[PDB]
Design an enzyme around this catalytic site. Structure first.
Site: not given
Ligand code: NA
Lengths: 112, 102
Positions: B19, B81, B88-89
């Site tokens: 990320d 959100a 995605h995890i």
């Protein structure tokens, strides 16, 4: 060392059960952190996700599918969050694998 | 300055990447290569893939040195959100995670 979830599973501790099959049980959290907050647990007492192994692949996919099915059944169409906590830094409370499902409010970022 | 992108893991079924706006000292993302837009739109045929993503998440967590604990997060829709409409995890570790989880 059975966890408190052994009492939810053997029904000696009453709970609001949303779903049950041979693989898993779904029940409302004792202390909801959102208007809808429930847990999806395997009957197999995998202590934490770090201790899941290759043989658990089908069970782990089953738990996510039960989570998303139950989320629909609980009216979470505007969204929801799935949470799995591992270990101390995860704030894992109970050492039996569980998926938290939270909805009915805006979940914020970061996720704790 | 968004951090540089980087793939941590790849197989025939999935990609794991950092990320670039991390919310923990370790923060990475597990995605299927199969276009699943959100967990609410997964179906029965995805059972093996969904368990594979959790096993990759746990395995990558070990490779990233998250032995003291970590959190897995999947966001669905606006109230979740969810930022990109692909499954995605999120894996977060390297600090104490708080409760509630947002
Ligand atoms: Na490739």
């Amino acid at each position: 060392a059975p966890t408190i979830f052994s009492r939810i599973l053997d029904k000696s501790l009453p709970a609001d059960i949303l779903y049950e099959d041979q693989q898993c049980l779904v029940f409302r959290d004792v202390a909801p952190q959102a208007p809808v907050h429930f847990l999806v647990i395997p009957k197999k007492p995998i202590p934490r996700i770090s201790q899941a192994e290759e043989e658990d692949q089908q069970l782990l996919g089953h738990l996510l599918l039960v989570a998303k099915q139950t989320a629909k059944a609980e009216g979470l169409g505007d969204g929801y969050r799935l949470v799995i906590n591992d270990g101390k830094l995860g704030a894992q409370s109970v050492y039996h694998l569980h998926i938290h499902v939270l909805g009915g409010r805006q979940l914020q970022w970061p996720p704790g």
